[PDB]
Amino acid sequence: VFSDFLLKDPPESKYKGLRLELAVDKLVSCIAVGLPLLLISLAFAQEITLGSQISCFAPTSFSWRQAAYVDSFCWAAVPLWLHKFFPYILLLVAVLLYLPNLFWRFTAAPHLSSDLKFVMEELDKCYNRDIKRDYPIVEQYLKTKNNSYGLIIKYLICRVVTLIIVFTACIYLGYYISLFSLTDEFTCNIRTGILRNDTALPPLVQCKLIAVGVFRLLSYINLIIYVLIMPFIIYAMLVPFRKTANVLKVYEVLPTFSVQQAPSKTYDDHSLFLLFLEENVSELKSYKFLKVLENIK
Amino acid sequence: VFSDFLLKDPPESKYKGLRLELAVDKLVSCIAVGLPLLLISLAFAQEITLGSQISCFAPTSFSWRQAAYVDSFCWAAVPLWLHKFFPYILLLVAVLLYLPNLFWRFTAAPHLSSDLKFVMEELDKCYNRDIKRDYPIVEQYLKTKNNSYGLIIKYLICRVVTLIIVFTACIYLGYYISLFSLTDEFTCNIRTGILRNDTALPPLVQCKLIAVGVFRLLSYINLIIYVLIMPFIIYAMLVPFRKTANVLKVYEVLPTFSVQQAPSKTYDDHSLFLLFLEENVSELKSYKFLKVLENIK
């Protein structure tokens, strides 16, 4: 009985290439973080070529600096801040979106990695020794992960943070779009604190926001992409209803492994671990041999 | 008896991946250092596009440079320095926050690393040889760390430095917010030292601070994030009341290891070492075998 409990070695950097994120979470994260960076890079580029935020039509009686004053004054205060702070909300949401994958990498990745390596090495050993009564090591190990919750708790944490951030960004951009595309100019007053009773200046002045066009374009692009990537976040968040293949069911054609009685797919570590195992089954060497073998029969 | 005291080798770069910081301290440090850098990067970017700090409405009778003089003069002196020095306090607190993890890395990390490697190699040897009377090497070694204090002293040093810096930054930003969001302009005088009795200049002039909006936004963001990450610092600082799993209790199902009588969780090196051991138990190979083994029984 107890002979295949002795730990010998990993006889290589054998795995070195396990994937610890299910490729859809990976694509979604890359896109959602990258898009605002490209947008605001272009934004800052064009704004540093324009070299101004607004332009006011000052009266000729002013000098240079006397007009620069009103042009700087009217850049301060219907909300104008949804325009003043646009290139900052995007960086903010980009960084907030980068955070959850850091959370994953530092709190769940190494545990999951060790578990995957253990299960895979055990399966390879079992097949290799029984192709030529022991205890169901892998069966009992996977039975242990049937009332724990840490892995799935952390997973759902990451997914819900991502969904919340994307939803908020969407409604912000939407209000921007539905508010600014009706005009781009406004009336500004200057004589307020000391010049209040100074008749040497106009009672009003006009100024125009000179980036509304580009910002509206970027808003449309970002909103479309985000509403496109929301459903994938939800489909990922629905773990116990995804599509699997039961690699543990392909392994049951050898003399003494198991016969998996019946699953239930509840929210627990068993389901998430099975998902990661199926994603990484590309590296299990014995898998293809057993597949063709059960095909011959 | 004395046979398992001979040092043979680490038969690989076996561990090469121990984690020397408990993932919550890691996340907190990354966030707290990174956030002000992103904020002040954006600040310096926008301020170099604006190319000015204030704007004063000089009388038309001035020339160009004669108005530049008042515009530069009134940028000097209710505190205006809380506005003048804003992009510097943030870099200061970022660097002060980076310091404690350097302190940890240089005074505690290598000792802890050697200790972890020793304990883990010893446990693996013990299991591997007794799965097929000796002295409790690991039990006595962990007994030695029961009246020393260096590790926990350094740990608490780092945590309290972090908490102090975060608290001070919070109250600074709070005073900024509660002071500047009532106005953005002030009255300035010029004729003071030589032009005092020079009637060729106005008795007053107005100037406006042209970054109050952006700085207030950054202040809100930073204050919210810092008050969010304070509780985690405290929860970390409360070492002897955290949640563990007693991996040394899972190891006691083999013939001659121990039976852990009773803990007390006082402030000492034993508790902190147990925390680090539980964090790094992902690499102990025998751990999962023993877990499934005690499950079968």
Author numbering:
A (entry chain B), B (entry chain A): 11 to 87, 101 to 155, 169 to 170, 195 to 357
Quote the study on this structure.
Pannexins are a family of ubiquitously expressed large-pore forming channels which regulate nucleotide release during apoptosis, blood pressure, and neuropathic pain. Among the pannexin family, pannexin 1 (Panx1) has garnered the most attention for its role as a large-pore forming channel responsible for ATP release from a variety of cell types. Different kinds of stimuli have been reported to activate Panx1 including voltage, membrane stretch, increased intracellular calcium levels, and positive membrane potentials. Like other large-pore forming channels, each Panx1 protomer harbors four transmembrane helices (TM1-4), two extracellular loops (ECL1 and 2), two intracellular loops (ICL1 and 2), and an amino (N)-terminal loop.
We further stabilized frPanx1 by truncating the C-terminus by 71 amino acids and by removing 24 amino acids from the intracellular loop between transmembrane helices 2 and 3. Purified frPanx1-ΔLC was reconstituted into nanodiscs composed of MSP2N2 (an engineered derivative of apolipoprotein) and soybean polar lipids, and subjected to cryo-electron microscopy (cryo-EM) and single-particle analysis. We used a total of 90,185 selected particles for 3D reconstruction at 3.0 Å resolution. The map quality was sufficient for de novo model building for the majority of frPanx1-ΔLC with the exception of disordered segments of the N-terminus (residues 1–10), ECL1 (88–100), and ICL1 (157–194). The frPanx1-ΔLC structure revealed a heptameric assembly, which is unique among the known eukaryotic channels. The Panx1 permeation pathway spans a length of 104 Å, with constrictions formed by the N-terminal loop, Ile58, and Trp74. The narrowest constriction is surrounded by Trp74 located on ECL1. We observed that the distance between the guanidino group of Arg75 and the benzene ring of Trp74 from an adjacent subunit is ~4 Å, suggesting that these two residues likely participate in an inter-subunit cation-π interaction key to Panx1 ion selectivity. Mapping such residues in the Panx1 structure revealed that they are clustered proximal to the extracellular constriction by Trp74, in a groove formed between ECL1 and ECL2. Based on the lack of channel activity at 0 mV, our current structure may represent a closed conformation.
